[PDB]
Symmetry: D2
Subunit: 252 residues, 4 copies
């Protein structure tokens, strides 16, 4: 019996631009290893082909779904299809997101809008349509994948990403309080500087910020998300797990 | 010599729907009392009439500007015109904002977009156009007026406001770090539950009002509820040279509310 | 293979005054279920009898030790003897602690001193003697069991406990940064209002109506139930395990949502 | 009318060893400039002489008191004498403190105990004896001078100081909640890496590189934040902190 045995987990941003342990891919793989049926969602189907192979070679259960989760009609259709095919959505992982460079002067206004939409509105829309399902079915768990950029300056200007990710963390807290009585838990993973395929489009420069003598990858995000999504976290809600090698604890 | 003597301060959301100490109005008056020339900005010109009267009764200097600070072309002109008329913009107070009720299910998606735009994009656009002025002139101070809704659930669902105000606090921190070398400081005031015209009008317009007022007061350890004057006094400290080494941080102005969860 | 297979875990405050899921007892049971050999430490054996019974009924491995972990000579001997018996100490759980009522006026100065000693100095001394073992052997994991009283006012005045638990959380962070290069991780669990034998017995043996107090405490928790030591233990298990290899200098709050609200 | 006009402010650690703006010297001077009568307290009486002359050259009101505020009997007498002479204690600034180097292995157990006593028990004892006075008189304001070492690793191991200062910050928050109904406010200043005489005596380049702003503050920065928090302009501010650190704690690059 896996730690998510029999659960249905909807994971956004489950594809990856290249080989390696991206957050979404690692979450899909780890959750399927623990017995969840994974609904793997991405705006590009081909980016999930490698994710599906990893899950299925290990005997896990995963279904790919094409969706633009910035579009509310598409999200509504995705959630309805998930309920139609799987009966329940027990777990939602809001993982879609990506940074764009620049502070308020350099960051173009259109890119600022895209950054808020991709990193924050997506999670809002997924919650809008998944929360009624979780309420009706007796409960559920939501895990937001945020970033240390939402709590610190970590090296680079990226003001839309920083603001959106801070908004994502706080949205998690206030949704947690509002829906706790319906047995819906909401928490965030706050990953730091990880070696993911998106990061690969210097590593010593990022490593110098990390007290631990290595750099994590999507598997580290996935293991924290696994705890928060599981019944072993039944009394954990409205909070975060920072996964950053100690970086945000220091300012030397 | 006042604590802001000779400074030019641009304050958004400086009007109110009615009489009383709104945050923007109180900031405009308090800053003018301390010798700043205030550029008072609002989307409604008449809503600043009372602000102008209070400033001038205090012997202060204020100029009203009609502007929709969600519109970048309008913001760019506002800043260029302020520099042309005043030479400098020493202080920017990002105060425009307003909440709308509802969590992710109840809050209409168009209202979510409006909430992010009004509470967060406005501050981004003001920073976009004021930061080059502050950099060129040798420095400046930015004060964001956020909310305890950005750090806690304080009683009501208002998810766009909560997310936007948390975004505003963090935007302040990252802009502070990026621009510190240019002598630009950025900090937030985090007001809790206050008596301001916009908050009190909404409550009066609507369940059991007596019970709501009591529940709100019960969240505050101090024996009273503050108002815009409290926000203004914290903003004054952060905008002043007495805070020359304070940047990237917040002052919570909430009567002790966020320190408790009993 | 359990999630702590082959690890040696030293857990302080592993006994309880009565039956039920105290934090230390639950940690000992859960860690042993995941394959750790548990060195279960408390002031007296009788409080650990039930802990040992539950560990062993679950097929786990546990050795009881008696120690006053406020006494550095005793701690030094406990660690040296543990290394002699087990070769290593892979995991340290600093769990001993207890609150005493009162703010700065009401709390006696002697009780303030005892509160800092019991809740904070114990963790400092365990780290003093365990860190060299972890450094020499190539790494380790430390989990401090703190309290929401270290981050919020949660209903009751207990200023020594609040200050000590905040100190414990921050000590964890600074030890994490200092020892990260030696592959030692340090994190805290921050439990909220739970059903543990110590908490429940104090409430039951105390001073207005008990049911009124229980309901007042539950009203602070957004979730529709109150957790127990098993919730603390599951968070500690994650933080002690290799699945948290990149997690250090931080906390997991286990409180049903309480500290996220101030309504 | 100064910002503390007519207030009585008891400031611990008001002495200073060496030239420059230490926190205690700067707090005493700034508060007296704003019209407070300052009760300047230190364990070394001579260390306050320059503080007194700076205040008095400006026409301000200050009285020195020799006291070891780790000793509760001495604190009790200090507070009673202050009420007898001044009628009220409106403001308490807990500024005594100092770090000692080392993490849990290196820091001697006796030094750990001294660190908790100096940085945390002192503030507890001052609150124990000042709070009843503030409650009886209708209110008051307490300002704790903590440190960024209570919220971050800032460069050096000093585990007793870090733990004690985190304890001081949280003690302030819980005392704020407990005593708010009595109109007593409690807040902390959280100073970062400052140029103080204490720092200069018992490097500046490494510290400066951690600070986003292009200079390093001193005790005057601590004093200005404490002045705000002690003043009636902060009437609705309680249970919180002002970090005075040039932006350092906002970054981890
Ligand atoms: Mg570095
Ligand atoms: Mg208003
Ligand atoms: Mg117990
Ligand atoms: Mg309540």
């Amino acid at each position: 019996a896996g730690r998510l045995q029999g659960k249905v987990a909807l994971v956004t941003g489950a594809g990856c631009i290249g080989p390696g342990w991206g957050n979404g891919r690692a979450i899909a793989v780890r959750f399927a290893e623990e017995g969840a049926h994974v609904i793997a969602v991405d705006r590009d189907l081909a980016s999930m082909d490698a994710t599906l192979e990893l899950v299925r070679a290990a005997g896990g259960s995963v279904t790919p779904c094409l969706c633009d989760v910035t579009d509310s009609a598409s999200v509504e259709r995705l959630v309805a299809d998930s309920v139609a095919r799987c009966g329940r959505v027990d777990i939602l992982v809001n993982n879609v997101g990506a940074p764009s460079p620049g502070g308020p002067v350099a960051l173009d206004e259109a890119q600022w809008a895209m950054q808020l939409e991709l990193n924050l509105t997506t999670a809002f829309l997924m919650c809008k349509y998944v929360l009624p399902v979780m309420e009706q079915q007796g409960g559920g768990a939501i895990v937001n994948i945020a970033s240390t950029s939402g709590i610190r300056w970590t090296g680079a200007a990226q003001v839309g990403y920083a603001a959106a990710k801070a908004g994502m963390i706080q949205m998690g807290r206030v949704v947690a309080v509002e829906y706790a009585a319906k047995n819906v838990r909401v928490n965030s993973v706050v990953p730091g500087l990880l070696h993911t395929p998106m990061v690969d489009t210097l590593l010593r420069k990022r490593q110098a910020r990390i007290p631990m003598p290595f750099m994590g990858d999507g598997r580290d995000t996935a293991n924290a998300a696994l705890f928060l999504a599981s019944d072993e976290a039944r009394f954990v809600t409205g909070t975060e797990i920072v996964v950053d090698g100690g970086m945000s604890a220091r300012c030397d």
